[PDB]
Scaffold this motif. Sequence first.
Motif, short mmCIF file in Angstrom:
data_model
loop_
_atom_site.label_atom_id
_atom_site.label_comp_id
_atom_site.label_asym_id
_atom_site.label_seq_id
_atom_site.Cartn_x
_atom_site.Cartn_y
_atom_site.Cartn_z
N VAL A 1 -7.67 8.13 1.20
CA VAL A 1 -6.76 7.04 0.85
C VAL A 1 -5.30 7.41 1.11
CG1 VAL A 1 -6.58 7.75 -1.59
CG2 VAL A 1 -6.37 5.33 -0.99
N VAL A 2 -4.98 8.70 1.16
CA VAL A 2 -3.61 9.11 1.41
C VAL A 2 -3.38 9.38 2.89
CG1 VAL A 2 -1.89 10.86 0.79
CG2 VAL A 2 -3.50 10.04 -0.92
N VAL B 1 -8.51 17.82 -7.36
CA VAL B 1 -8.39 16.94 -6.21
C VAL B 1 -7.19 17.39 -5.40
CG1 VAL B 1 -7.56 14.62 -5.68
CG2 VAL B 1 -9.63 14.86 -6.91
N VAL B 2 -7.35 17.45 -4.08
CA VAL B 2 -6.29 17.79 -3.14
C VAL B 2 -5.74 16.54 -2.47
CG1 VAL B 2 -5.63 19.36 -1.29
CG2 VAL B 2 -7.63 19.88 -2.74
N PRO B 3 -4.62 15.97 -2.93
CA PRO B 3 -4.16 14.69 -2.39
C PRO B 3 -3.71 14.75 -0.94
CG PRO B 3 -3.15 15.15 -4.50
CD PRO B 3 -3.75 16.43 -4.02
N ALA B 4 -3.37 15.93 -0.42
CA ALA B 4 -3.01 16.07 0.98
C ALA B 4 -4.21 15.98 1.91
CB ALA B 4 -2.26 17.38 1.20
N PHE C 1 0.20 -8.04 -7.18
CA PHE C 1 1.58 -8.11 -6.67
C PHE C 1 2.47 -8.88 -7.65
CE2 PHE C 1 -0.23 -7.57 -2.18
CZ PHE C 1 -0.19 -6.20 -2.32
N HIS D 1 0.86 -1.18 0.00
CA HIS D 1 0.00 0.00 0.00
C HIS D 1 0.90 1.23 0.00
CE1 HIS D 1 -3.86 2.04 0.77
NE2 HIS D 1 -3.17 2.84 1.56
N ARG D 2 1.37 1.62 -1.18
CA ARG D 2 2.33 2.70 -1.32
C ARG D 2 1.60 4.03 -1.16
NH1 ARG D 2 7.15 0.92 -3.41
NH2 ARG D 2 7.97 2.79 -2.38
N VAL D 3 1.74 4.63 0.02
CA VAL D 3 1.13 5.93 0.28
C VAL D 3 1.91 7.00 -0.46
CG1 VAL D 3 0.45 7.54 2.09
CG2 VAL D 3 0.39 5.08 2.52
N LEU D 4 1.19 7.87 -1.17
CA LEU D 4 1.83 8.98 -1.86
C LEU D 4 2.49 9.91 -0.85
CD1 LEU D 4 2.21 10.99 -4.31
CD2 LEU D 4 -0.10 11.78 -3.82
N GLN E 1 2.57 15.00 -1.44
CA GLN E 1 1.18 15.41 -1.38
C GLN E 1 1.01 16.89 -1.68
OE1 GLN E 1 0.43 14.47 2.64
NE2 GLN E 1 0.76 12.27 2.39
N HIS E 2 2.10 17.61 -1.91
CA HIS E 2 2.04 19.04 -2.15
C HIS E 2 2.73 19.43 -3.44
CE1 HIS E 2 0.22 19.87 1.73
NE2 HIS E 2 0.99 18.92 2.20
N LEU F 1 -6.91 13.72 0.90
CA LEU F 1 -7.61 12.52 0.47
C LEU F 1 -7.56 11.43 1.53
CD1 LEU F 1 -6.78 11.98 -3.21
CD2 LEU F 1 -8.93 12.59 -2.24
N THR G 1 -2.12 3.58 -5.46
CA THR G 1 -1.30 3.02 -4.41
C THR G 1 -0.76 1.64 -4.75
OG1 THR G 1 -3.17 2.01 -3.25
CG2 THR G 1 -2.61 4.28 -2.68
N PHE G 2 -1.29 0.99 -5.78
CA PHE G 2 -0.76 -0.28 -6.23
C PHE G 2 0.36 0.00 -7.22
CE2 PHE G 2 -0.54 -3.94 -9.04
CZ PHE G 2 -0.54 -4.99 -8.15
N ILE H 1 -6.66 23.63 3.68
CA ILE H 1 -6.14 23.96 2.35
C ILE H 1 -6.99 25.06 1.71
CG2 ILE H 1 -5.67 23.03 0.06
CD1 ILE H 1 -3.72 22.19 2.25
N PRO I 1 2.02 17.95 -7.04
CA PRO I 1 1.24 19.18 -6.93
C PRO I 1 0.32 19.18 -5.72
CG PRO I 1 0.12 17.73 -8.37
CD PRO I 1 1.37 17.00 -7.95
N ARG I 2 -0.18 20.36 -5.36
CA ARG I 2 -1.15 20.44 -4.28
C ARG I 2 -2.56 20.25 -4.79
NH1 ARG I 2 -0.83 24.90 0.55
NH2 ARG I 2 0.52 23.28 1.41
N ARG J 1 -6.70 11.27 -9.12
CA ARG J 1 -6.46 10.70 -7.81
C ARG J 1 -5.28 9.74 -7.88
NH1 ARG J 1 -11.28 11.24 -4.32
NH2 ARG J 1 -12.66 12.63 -5.50
N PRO J 2 -4.48 9.67 -6.82
CA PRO J 2 -3.27 8.85 -6.86
C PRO J 2 -3.59 7.37 -6.85
CG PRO J 2 -3.56 9.81 -4.71
CD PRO J 2 -4.51 10.50 -5.61
#
Lengths: 175, 139, 201, 123, 109
Positions: C124-125, C117-120, B2, A155-158, A161-162, C122, A173-174, C20, A164-165, A170-171
Amino acid sequence: KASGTLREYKVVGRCLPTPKCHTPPLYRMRIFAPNHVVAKSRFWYFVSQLKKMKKSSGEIVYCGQVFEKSPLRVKNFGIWLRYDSRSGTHNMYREYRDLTTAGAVTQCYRDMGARHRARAHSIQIMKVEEIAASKCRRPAVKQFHDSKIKFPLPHRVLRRQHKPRFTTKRPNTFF
Amino acid sequence: VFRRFVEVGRVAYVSFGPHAGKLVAIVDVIDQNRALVDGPCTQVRRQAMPFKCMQLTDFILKFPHSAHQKYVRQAWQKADINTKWAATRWAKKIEARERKAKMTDFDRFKVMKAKKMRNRIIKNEVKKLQKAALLKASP
Amino acid sequence: EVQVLVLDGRGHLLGRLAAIVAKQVLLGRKVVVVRCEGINISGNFYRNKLKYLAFLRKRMNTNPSRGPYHFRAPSRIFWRTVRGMLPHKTKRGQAALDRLKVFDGIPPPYDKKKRMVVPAALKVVRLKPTRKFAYLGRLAHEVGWKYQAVTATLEEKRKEKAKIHYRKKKQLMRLRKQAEKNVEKKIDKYTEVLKTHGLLV
Amino acid sequence: KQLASGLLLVTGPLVLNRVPLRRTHQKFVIATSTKIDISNVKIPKHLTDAYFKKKKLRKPRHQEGEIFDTEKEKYEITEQRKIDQKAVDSQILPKIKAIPQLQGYLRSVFALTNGIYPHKLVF
Amino acid sequence: SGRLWSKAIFAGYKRGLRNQREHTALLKIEGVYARDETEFYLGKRCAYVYKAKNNTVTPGGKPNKTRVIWGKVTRAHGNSGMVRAKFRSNLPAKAIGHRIRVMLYPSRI
RNA sequence: GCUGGGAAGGCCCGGCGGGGAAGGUGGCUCGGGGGCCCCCGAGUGUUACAGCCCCCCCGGCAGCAGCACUCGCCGAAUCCCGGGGCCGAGGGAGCGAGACCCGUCGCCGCGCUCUCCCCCCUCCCGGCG
RNA sequence: UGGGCCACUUUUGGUAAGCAGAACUGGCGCUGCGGGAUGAACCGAACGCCGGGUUAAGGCGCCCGAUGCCGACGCUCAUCA
RNA sequence: CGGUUGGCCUCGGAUAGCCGGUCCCCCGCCGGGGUCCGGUGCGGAGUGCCCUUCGUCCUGGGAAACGGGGCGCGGCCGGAGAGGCGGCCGCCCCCUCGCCCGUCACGCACCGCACGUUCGUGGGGAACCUGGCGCUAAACCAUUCGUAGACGACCUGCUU
Ligand SMILES: [Mg+2]
Ligand SMILES: [Mg+2]
Ligand SMILES: [Mg+2]
Ligand SMILES: [Mg+2]
Ligand SMILES: [Mg+2]
Ligand SMILES: [Mg+2]
Ligand SMILES: [Mg+2]
Ligand SMILES: [Mg+2]
Ligand SMILES: [Mg+2]
Ligand SMILES: [Mg+2]
Ligand SMILES: [Mg+2]
């Protein structure tokens, strides 16, 4: 005593030569400290608890950093320590996996602060040695004792995060 | 699910850090957050590296764990990775990214003119394509 | 950047998105936040509901009509969080609070625009996936918001129209790829210029 | 050439972007990375800061002003300036027509749009 | 024809929590969010341009309603873009949140 | 520059080798799936169709707190260049001439001439090929 | 001026007290400023009028200057965290 | 009264998974499945994409030729959550110019210098001229009422 990343020093000292014993004995400690000033301070602390010797009637004949002998081989480390909680004091044995002895001791300090809220002035490290794989007790190291070890990074957390802000997608995680 | 695993011989791509943009072979695993790491053909000497800093590729080398640099180096060379990578399209995607970063002002002008004409031709062909595809008169 | 910044509230955490939004709207930057019923709050639904009911309990007991106004719509709940993060007793904070606009669902000046979308912020993040969270729409509906069914049906209509538009866009993209394969022989001179300078892998 | 007072002597090839031989300040130009090898281009020796220094006529012998001098506001391009321009453009421009797209590049102007930021631009 | 200035935002004055220093201004330049990107803008001229009622003289032009307070960027203010600038007169507080031009003048590139 | 006159590490199939072991390679035995043939899982063991650790009889070469960003403390053992910002307070410093239009002066650091030879780019060049 | 008061440590009476009474040093009174949201006494630091630089104590999601670091390792789910 | 100094005209979402395209079934010849083929540190990429402006004159080459431009006419369709919008056909009227690579010269070249450059025919308020199409009301007071009422307010009636 605060911290950083620690270095291992060997500090050798002796009582001052009085005209009764013209050659007092030398004593040697391995001391894990941020720098050599803290190393000499901790030496005088420990040797004053052990022997009847103080910094005034004594001297440091050597204080030198022990370099890591094999800093490219992953070793197991056993730490024998004592510390004191808000109640009385306890002996303890921890095991770590690291490349350097001082790295494993630093790991032990951050771990004791995390798990027992113990401060570095409360901790006393009394033994540290290099354990092989077949002599370990802790499952957190024995699970890494495997020659064909294999696991994903699930579960690769981004992290950026800023940058870009504000994006439009949407990111993921896989990976 | 995976398709990529952290294992001995797995080739990772160091993305940030002092060795950013590099290729790296996983030699051993140090306790759930770091890996003993050595790129001998990509000029990265052996050290500890965080899994947060590495990204796994599809290449896996073949050597026993905690082997020496000459063994990992000849395992890299036999089926060398510097030609599999770079002619992977991840690597040329990176290469295009960096030359687009290095693109100068006169280069930017030439790109603008070329892209403008290319978009004109593509747009006219799209208009012809849809005005020909509208030729439908079937019951 | 002189245009409006349009954010999609679905999947975002309330206070992080509010922080934000508050800094952006103080720095300028007219911000629209749509779909405030999709905003998430960390912690389980029951304790979030209890926090809102304690807020509902807070009441000026001499004159509740004068007292603190407990807004029920998710848009107004988000707006009040940004209000709490703003300096709203000043003219600058009031100008920023006017520069912000919030909506439940996506009304039709904004349903035909691209939402950011603001990933900071989100979920899931910013949350571990083995953690409970709540939905602002469900929380609002159970503390007294009236309009979650009409918003749901209007959002279903909007999603059908967006599916139709997206299928049009996909057919256009297929046609453009076909046109490249048709006239590549007269743009080969221009294509290699772009490949040389990093566009068009 | 850079002149003897630090000011840079530039020319647009005036038939391209209407920039004559002028002085311009080093702090107020941006230097790009494209070159024209201008070895063996004859520069007249009468091309100095005194040649480029502004000219004045007001005011001869008069102290009170109610009538106006409606002449000399038309700055005249002198014939020596025109023939110097002709000579230096005649020996620069065939070298500009050599490399491709450069004359269109010099006809165009520089600008910033909604994307590019000057700290990221390579010049 | 074309913009020729980078767009910044007057974010506020130099300040602690309960004291503000109006001789220094804080600027958020669009596109830069680290110190080692603020390094480019480190001596550039900057301008607060605004309109008013009466006409003022324009250099090289006819009088109109535009007025300018000139300044320049002096250094970076803290880890994420955010330079601090110094203007000839201190900037009015109605300019907070508004546009400030960074002019690419004196050039080192 | 110092240090364990750094520790590790690179290359020389390091070579005569000597051992040792598992986070056990090959080979074998057993169990599963693919057209008697292949790979994964469990026991065996010591090099094999991988490797790891220690001692050398001795190491050699390159590099050297690395211009492959592994881990320090430094500079009489330390210098050169560049960029941004703020600022310009003060106002008769002349020992000589008998100051003369008006102190380009003190201290400190330098360069040339009052000696003679060279040689290299030059130049109103003089005629110019 | 001869009403003092508060704080570390020591200390008497009192179950105790933002109670009463001592010792020592510092403060407040007579003192603004940075921090502790707020506060005579805490923490930093004591003040002519200004520019530049840097700090202390304290901080750096937003109010609110500063982490918008791809910060490190763990611990913890609370239907009164 | 001032701000501002190109635009983005849109899937739903998942995050221990996604995105795109085709051969065989089903839905009154499009959409849905099942194969199969690609890509996945997103390149059918928001670290993205689209527009791009010095202007004209002689002169070629390909791009185009099934085109461009008429605030030019008429008609049709879609959009209701805040529709204030978007799209398509027919009539005729000017140009084969505008897009890319070239040839040729000219324009105030205002003599180094700031607020230049758009949105923009911006918003608001008075006033003058100029034509074409139209329209010719209510509210309040006073008076009555008493379903109302401290006063205001409120409920009512007044040439058929
Ligand atoms: Mg002076
Ligand atoms: Mg008294
Ligand atoms: Mg007392
Ligand atoms: Mg008093
Ligand atoms: Mg005093
Ligand atoms: Mg005080
Ligand atoms: Mg205070
Ligand atoms: Mg407090
Ligand atoms: Mg100061
Ligand atoms: Mg604070
Ligand atoms: Mg801030």
